[PDB]
Design a protein around this ligand. Structure first.
Ligand code: NA
Ligand code: NA
Length: 326
DNA sequence: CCGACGGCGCATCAGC
DNA sequence: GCTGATGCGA
DNA sequence: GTCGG
């Protein structure tokens, strides 16, 4: 909160770059800047002070000086009042509506949730669902609800086939007090990188979850990845729980733990391990870990049967997810 | 100066 | 109808 | 917008 005004500012500039100007790299540049500054244990007094932080350049430094001297940014103030831009930016909060769709909608007069509600025929399946649960999707999930959600998922998966292995990752696995959604990694001994991928291993799990009315909607669904909506059962006379976003990924047995490691995060922790992995002759990614030859040629992936194995390779002591903040 | 900046599954579109 | 490109979310 | 080869 030391520089909340500054980080809020950069984050707002960030969204407009992505959603309105469609300049994704500028979006990430602003986010990077907002992040480094968010971790700075001091109240910034000038643009030059912040410029020393990695990610803050001349332009953001110039903007910080303006904000400190006036308490605002003229360019930001302007875009905020712009009917077209503020509307485009806003519409992207609807899942399924990206920068392009937001732009086309505003071009034809569709600027608010109400406008969207009156134009269902112009919305695809995903977008209709994003609109339907607009409010719910923006709410966070208390860990206690995640536990109840995990209980259902683990139970139903085992019910389908006790040989399935399912792991709820994300900040939740690291012990987060709340979550934005639920990410489930699924695998089965019968499915490996070079074997049959039976088009129903994932389907049977999604089907069972719908049968017990846990999964309520489907955004997308293929043979390896499902993205949908779910909701805990409500108690009599009890305010119903909000709908939640849940993804379920089927990964080959041999790439499962590389998957759990990666989707467990955090993002910052992954980069460090990737760096360390490199400075050890190994290359780690979402799927595997491979040795790097002398001339930089990657060798075939190394056998992995646990998160620990990955650590063993890069000479690192296994770390509990609760400590993988970075 | 000027290219990199993350990458892939799925839904849907463009081009044939 | 088929194939590759694009939008989207993660 | 920022970095760096
Ligand atoms: Na800097
Ligand atoms: Na969106």
């Amino acid at each position: 909160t030391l520089n909340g005004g500054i980080t809020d500012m950069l984050t707002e500039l960030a969204n407009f770059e992505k959603n309105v100007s469609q300049a994704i790299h500028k979006y990430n540049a602003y986010r990077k800047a907002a992040s480094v500054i968010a971790k700075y244990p001091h109240k910034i007094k000038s643009g030059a002070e912040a410029k020393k932080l990695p990610g803050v350049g001349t332009k953001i430094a110039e903007k910080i000086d303006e904000f400190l001297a006036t308490g605002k940014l003229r360019k930001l103030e302007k875009i905020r009042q712009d009917d077209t831009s503020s509307s485009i930016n806003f519409l992207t909060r609807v899942s399924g509506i990206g920068p392009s769709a937001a732009r086309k909608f505003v071009d034809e007069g569709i600027k608010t949730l109400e406008d969207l509600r009156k134009n269902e025929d112009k919305l695809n399946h995903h977008q209709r669902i994003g609109l339907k649960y607009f409010g719910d999707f923006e709410k966070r999930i208390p860990r206690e609800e995640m536990l109840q959600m995990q209980d259902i998922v683990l139970n139903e998966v085992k019910k389908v086939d006790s040989e399935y292995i399912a792991t709820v990752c994300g900040s939740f696995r690291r012990g987060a007090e709340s979550s934005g959604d639920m990410d489930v990694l699924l695998t089965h001994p019968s499915f490996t990188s070079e074997s049959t991928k039976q088009p129903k291993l994932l389907h049977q799990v999604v089907e069972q979850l719908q049968k017990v009315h846990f999964i309520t909607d489907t955004l997308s669904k293929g043979e390896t990845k499902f993205m949908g909506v779910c909701q805990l059962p409500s108690k009599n006379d009890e305010k119903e729980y909000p709908h939640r976003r849940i993804d379920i990924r089927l990964i080959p047995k041999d790439q499962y733990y590389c998957g759990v490691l990666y989707f467990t995060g955090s993002d910052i922790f992954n980069k460090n391990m990737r760096a360390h992995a490199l400075e050890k002759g190994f290359t780690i990614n979402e799927y595997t870990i491979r040795p790097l030859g002398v001339t930089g040629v990657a060798g075939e992936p190394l056998p992995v049967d646990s998160e620990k194995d990955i650590f063993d390779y890069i000479q690192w002591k296994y770390r509990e997810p609760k400590d993988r903040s970075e």
